[PDB]
């Protein structure tokens, strides 16, 4: 089958807690949720 050619292809998550404050122990590990924001894991 033929396939149509693709054309016309169509805030800020903050990893601040990880770099701020004393790091927690593995049992007391700090967990955070990111939603509706643009993360930059590669930069981190």
């Amino acid at each position: 089958s033929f396939e149509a050619k693709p054309s016309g292809s169509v805030v800020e998550c903050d990893f601040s807690p990880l770099l701020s404050g004393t790091p927690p122990q593995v049992y007391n590990f700090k967990r955070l949720v990111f939603t509706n924001c643009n993360y930059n894991l590669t930069k981190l």
Binding site: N28, F29, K30, R31, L32, V33, T35
Partner: protein, 50 residues
């Protein structure tokens, strides 16, 4: 989760806010709340069901 924000009339529930707690809570305890008033102005309130 607050039902009123997504639809006051519907009664459907949506997650209004998120609070981050690492600890997992196993027990639920209800704190009784009482408002002092004069006998003439005494107020009766609907019970909440868990």
């Amino acid at each position: 989760f607050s039902s009123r924000y997504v639809d006051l009339y519907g009664g459907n529930m949506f997650q209004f806010a998120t609070l981050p707690v690492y600890d997992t809570i196993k027990y639920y305890s209800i704190i009784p709340h009482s408002i002092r008033s004069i006998q003439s102005d005494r107020k009766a309130w609907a019970a909440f069901y868990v």
